Scaffold this active site. Structure first.
Site, PDB file in Angstrom:
ATOM      1  N   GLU A 206     -12.840   2.667   8.779  1.00 51.72           N
ATOM      2  CA  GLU A 206     -13.823   1.550   8.489  1.00 51.72           C
ATOM      3  C   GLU A 206     -14.952   1.852   7.644  1.00 51.72           C
ATOM      4  OE1 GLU A 206     -15.042   0.000  12.242  1.00 51.72           O
ATOM      5  OE2 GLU A 206     -15.788   2.171  12.818  1.00 51.72           O
TER       6      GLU A 206
ATOM      7  N   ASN B 283      -9.234  -3.794  -4.310  1.00 50.33           N
ATOM      8  CA  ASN B 283      -9.708  -2.013  -4.132  1.00 50.33           C
ATOM      9  C   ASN B 283     -10.595  -1.900  -5.308  1.00 50.33           C
ATOM     10  OD1 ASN B 283      -6.680  -0.877  -2.682  1.00 50.33           O
ATOM     11  ND2 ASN B 283      -8.236  -1.542  -1.684  1.00 50.33           N
TER      12      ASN B 283
ATOM     13  N   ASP C 172      -1.300   2.152  -1.437  1.00 48.03           N
ATOM     14  CA  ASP C 172      -1.545   0.695  -1.279  1.00 48.03           C
ATOM     15  C   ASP C 172      -2.563   0.214  -2.385  1.00 48.03           C
ATOM     16  OD1 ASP C 172      -0.611  -1.516   0.220  1.00 48.03           O
ATOM     17  OD2 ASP C 172      -2.498  -1.085   1.737  1.00 48.03           O
TER      18      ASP C 172
ATOM     19  N   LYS D  48      -4.345  -2.374  -4.110  1.00 46.92           N
ATOM     20  CA  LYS D  48      -4.480  -3.740  -4.182  1.00 46.92           C
ATOM     21  C   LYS D  48      -5.697  -4.300  -5.222  1.00 46.92           C
ATOM     22  CE  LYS D  48      -2.701  -4.360   0.497  1.00 46.92           C
ATOM     23  NZ  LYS D  48      -2.189  -5.214   1.531  1.00 46.92           N
TER      24      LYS D  48
ATOM     25  N   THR E 233      -2.675   4.841  14.704  1.00 45.89           N
ATOM     26  CA  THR E 233      -1.651   5.784  14.197  1.00 45.89           C
ATOM     27  C   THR E 233      -0.491   4.939  13.342  1.00 45.89           C
ATOM     28  OG1 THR E 233      -0.247   5.416  16.288  1.00 45.89           O
ATOM     29  CG2 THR E 233      -2.089   7.216  16.341  1.00 45.89           C
TER      30      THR E 233
ATOM     31  N   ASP F  17     -11.491   2.490  -1.835  1.00 49.79           N
ATOM     32  CA  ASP F  17     -10.779   2.963  -0.902  1.00 49.79           C
ATOM     33  C   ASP F  17      -9.387   3.554  -1.364  1.00 49.79           C
ATOM     34  OD1 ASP F  17     -10.191   3.209   1.856  1.00 49.79           O
ATOM     35  OD2 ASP F  17      -9.354   1.424   2.049  1.00 49.79           O
TER      36      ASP F  17
END
Ligand SMILES: CCN(CC)CCNC(=O)c1c(C)[nH]c(/C=C2\C(=O)Nc3ccc(Cl)cc32)c1C
Ligand SMILES: [Ca+2]
Lengths: 6, 279
Positions: free
Chosen positions: B19, B125, B120, B122, B159, B141
């Site tokens: 986070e 980001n 990922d 996006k 996980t 990120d």
């Protein structure tokens, strides 16, 4: 409860 | 001692086991993005993070470590999201988009050559460093600790990867998958909608597999053949044939002078307003 790097 | 060092101001993002918080350094008053990661590959990536320096990648300022977490003190980027900033322009061209993609390609190439996969990738980001018109675009990120919720245990125990065996043909993150993502972002930067936006989820699957992309009228009427060519080389269905970031950086639309200077703001801005959930 932390150690600072470097 | 993490609370002795930093004032926590708000949550900027959250994922399965990581986070990011907006924090104020108590001693200096300076603001940072603190990425908190719940505990060899991660420690090796951090070692690399410490060493690497790119103008389009958030700087790692410090690391604190506890028995249960790493706290990565990161550069805060306060210029806003890529597509918000395009809406605020009032004028916009293919060359504006090309300059953003060149920066993203440069950043991701540098990650790739240092053994990091972005994961990922996006639109959210990609954040501008400053409010200034000429601001660099920043990757934020990325890597092993990318905040995503993947598979059925992501939230529950933090996980990833609990996905039924028949679903994934291969592990879902790779350098070529990052390149494909950059292709998709390029497509939306030039028209304001993703490829096959109006297809059902089921048909989209087939279309992506087939890999014959369309550049519909009227939206693509005034876009260069070079731009379309460039996009197709990144959206290429065969990952062995797909452009790498290196190869993409050498394409005329990025590296040469094929990117047009025609104002496409009117169409692109309408489509962003129509198609972006948060508009
Ligand atoms: C999207 C959810 N919410 C809107 C309702 C928050 C909007 N996001 C931000 O304001 C934001 C800001 C100002 N900065 C960041 C993210 C940063 C950031 O600024 N630096 C940084 C370094 C590493 C990682 Cl993983 C993430 C970041 C974010 C997500
Ligand atoms: Ca022109």
């Amino acid at each position: 409860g932390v150690s600072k790097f470097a | 001692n993490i609370r002795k060092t930093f004032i926590f101001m708000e949550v900027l993002g959250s994922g399965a086991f990581s986070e990011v918080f907006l924090v104020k350094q108590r001693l200096t008053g300076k603001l940072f993005a603190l990425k908190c990661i719940k505990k060899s590959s991660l420690e090796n990536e951090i070692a690399v993070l410490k060493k690497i320096k790119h103008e389009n990648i958030v700087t790692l300022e410090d690391i604190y470590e506890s028995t249960t977490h790493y706290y990565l003190v990161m550069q805060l980027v306060s210029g806003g999201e890529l597509f918000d900033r395009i809406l605020e322009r009032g004028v916009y061209t293919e060359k504006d988009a090309s300059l953003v993609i060149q920066q993203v390609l440069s950043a991701v190439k540098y990650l790739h050559e240092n053994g990091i996969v972005h994961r990922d990738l996006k639109p959210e980001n990609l954040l501008y460093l400053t409010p200034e018109e000429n601001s660099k675009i920043m990757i934020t990120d990325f890597g092993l600790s990318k905040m995503e919720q993947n598979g059925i245990m992501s939230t529950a125990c933090g996980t990833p990867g609990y996905v039924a065996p028949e679903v994934l043909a291969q592990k879902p993150y790779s350098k070529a998958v990052d390149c494909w993502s950059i292709g998709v972002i390029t497509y939306i930067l030039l028209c304001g909608y993703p490829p096959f936006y109006e297809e059902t989820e089921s048909k989209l699957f087939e279309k992506i597999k087939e890999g014959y992309y369309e550049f519909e009228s009227p939206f693509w009427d005034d876009i260069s053949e070079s731009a379309k060519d460039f996009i197709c080389h990144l959206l290429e269905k065969d990952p062995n044939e797909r452009y790498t970031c290196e190869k993409a950086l050498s394409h005329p639309w990025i590296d040469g002078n094929t990117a047009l200077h025609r104002d496409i703001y009117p169409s692109v801005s309408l489509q962003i307003q129509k198609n972006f959930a948060k508009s």
